[PDB]
Write a protein that binds this ligand. Structure first.
Ligand SMILES: Cc1ccc(C(=O)Nc2cccc(C(F)(F)F)c2)cc1-c1ccc2nc(N)ncc2c1
Ligand SMILES: Cc1ccc(C(=O)Nc2cccc(C(F)(F)F)c2)cc1-c1ccc2nc(N)ncc2c1
Lengths: 244, 244
C-alpha cells in the first residue's frame, strides 16, 4: 500500500522450477530460474509465509538471503542459490575432504557467529545441523532451514519437546563433530533408538580421531545435561575464532 | 480533503527490534513495517513533535534522510528509511572505514555540504551538525539527519560556534562553524574534536594527514565573525572541485 513499502512479490509465471533438491512433509525445495536467466532456489509450501518475514528480519551475512515470494498458494519462498550446496555434501567433495582443521574451525566460527545473531534476536533454530548449512561461492557458511519436516536433538527436546537456544547449543556441538570429521554422521553405527537409550545413561559421543582434545571439551560443554550449564553462542564464536 | 497527502500508518504495523539511541526527548529504533520493510523509528515521549515530520517533508532532498510516515497517536512515531551503515562517526571507524581515501572522504564531505546548501536555501538552521548526525547509505552516500534527541526540533559543545555558546544565537553561519568541525571528524576516522569553551581565541591544529588546503577551509569555517564564514554553496564547490 504505502509507496515506501518493499515489494517482495513476483508473479508465479516468472519462475521455472528445474531440479527438485529436496522434499518433505510441508513442501519441496527446487533449483530454478527467475525471468529466464537468474538462477534461484525455491521452496514450495504444500497448500492444505511467516517464514519469509522471519528470514527478512534475520537478514545477516551468516544466514541465507531471502530474494522474494509468491503470495498465492502454493506459497513460494525464493532465495539465492548455492552451487556448493549443503555443508554435509560439500565436506564430502574432494575440495572439502582436504580442508585443514584450521579452515574447518573458521567455518564453525562463522556458524557460531550466525547462531549468536539468532540468539541476539531471540529466535530458536530447532534444526541446526550440517545438512541445514549452505556453503557460499567463497566457501563461507550460511545458516538455513529446509528439512521441510534425532542425533542432533537435545535430551530435553527429545523427552519433553522443550526447545530453547540452549537446545540449539547442543545441536551445535553435534554439528562440530560433523565438521571435524568432514561429514561423518554423528554416533557412527548407532541407530536412533540406540542413541536415545544411551543418552538415558548419560552417554556422549567419543572424541573423533583427529579431533583435538581442546575442541572435544568444547563439544562436551555443549552437551551438558542441564540446558543452563551450556555456553552461549557468543562464547562459542569467541573460542572458535581464537582457537589457534 | 481528498487531495491531502497520506502519511500515517497504524502503530500495529510496526515492530521495533533494536533501540539505536535515546535522549531526553525519546528514542530511535530499527524496526520493520508489516514484517519485511526495514525502517528507522523515532518514538517521542508523551508528556509539536509532528512539526519535525512536516519539516522533514519540506526539506525533502537527496542529501537529507527520507521521511516515510508517522503515527499520529501519542507516543508519536516518525518513520524513515533505514541506512545500513548508520552514522558516519560509526562508519568512519569500520575497518572498511577510513580504509577510504581523501578522494572518497571528501566526496562525502561535499555531499554533506550539498545537503546544508539546501538547508541554507530553505532558511532552516540545523544547530546540531556533527558526524554523529550524518547517515551513510548502503552505497556509502551521506545524508543529513538529527537524532541526538536532546532538544526539541523547531523550525553540542565542541561543535558549537562561540556566539552560539555565548548568546545562543544560532544561524546558518553557526552551522558553517559546525561543518568546519565536522570536517575534522572526517579526516580522522571520526576522532573526537579538540583531542574547549575557555580556549574559544584558540583554533584546532591541523589533523595528521589533512591537506593544508582542507585546513584553510576549516579556518574559514572557524572565523570569529559569523558573517565572514563562507556560504555552504561555496564549501560544496571547493569540496567537489578539490583534486581538479
Ligand atoms: C529456497 C529456500 C527458502 C528458505 C530457506 C530457509 O533456510 N528458510 C528458513 C526458515 C526459517 C529460519 C531460517 C534461518 F533462520 F535459518 F535463517 C531459514 C532455504 C532455502 C534453500 C534450500 C536449499 C538450497 N540449496 C541450495 N543449493 N542453494 C540455496 C538453497 C536455499
Ligand atoms: C527515525 C528518524 C526520524 C527523524 C530523523 C531526523 O533526522 N529528523 C530530522 C529533524 C530535524 C531536521 C532534519 C534535517 F534537517 F536533516 F532534515 C531531520 C532521523 C531518524 C533516523 C535516526 C537514526 C537512523 N539510523 C539509521 N541507521 N538509519 C536511519 C535513521 C533515521
Amino acid at each position: 500500500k504505502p509507496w515506501w513499502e518493499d515489494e517482495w512479490e513476483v508473479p508465479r509465471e516468472t519462475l521455472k522450477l528445474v531440479e527438485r533438491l529436496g522434499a518433505g512433509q510441508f513442501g519441496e525445495v527446487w533449483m530454478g530460474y527467475y525471468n529466464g536467466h537468474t538462477k534461484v532456489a525455491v521452496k514450495s509450501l504444500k497448500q492444505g509465509l511467516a517464514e519469509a518475514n522471519l528470514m527478512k528480519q534475520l537478514q545477516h551475512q551468516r544466514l541465507v538471503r531471502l530474494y522474494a515470494v509468491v503470495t498465492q498458494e502454493p506459497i513460494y519462498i525464493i532465495t539465492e542459490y548455492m552451487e556448493n550446496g549443503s555443508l554435509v555434501d560439500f565436506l564430502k567433495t574432494p575440495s572439502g575432504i582436504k580442508l585443514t582443521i584450521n579452515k574447518l574451525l573458521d567455518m564453525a566460527a562463522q556458524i557460531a557467529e550466525g547462531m549468536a545473531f539468532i540468539e541476539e534476536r531471540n529466535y530458536i533454530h530447532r534444526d541446526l545441523r550440517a545438512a541445514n548449512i549452505l556453503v557460499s561461492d567463497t566457501l563461507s557458511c550460511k545458516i538455513a532451514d529446509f528439512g521441510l519436516a534425532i542425533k542432533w536433538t537435545a535430551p530435553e527436546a527429545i523427552n519433553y519437546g522443550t526447545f530453547t537456544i540452549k537446545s540449539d547449543v547442543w545441536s551445535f556441538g553435534i554439528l562440530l563433530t560433523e565438521i571435524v570429521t568432514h561429514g561423518r554422521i554423528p554416533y557412527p553405527g548407532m541407530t536412533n533408538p540406540e542413541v536415545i537409550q544411551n543418552l538415558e545413561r548419560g552417554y556422549r559421543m567419543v572424541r573423533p580421531d583427529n579431533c583435538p582434545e581442546e575442541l572435544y571439551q568444547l563439544m562436551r560443554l555443549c552437551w551438558k545435561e542441564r540446558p543452563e550449564d551450556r555456553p552461549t553462542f557468543d562464547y562459542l564464536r569467541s573460542v572458535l575464532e581464537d582457537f589457534f
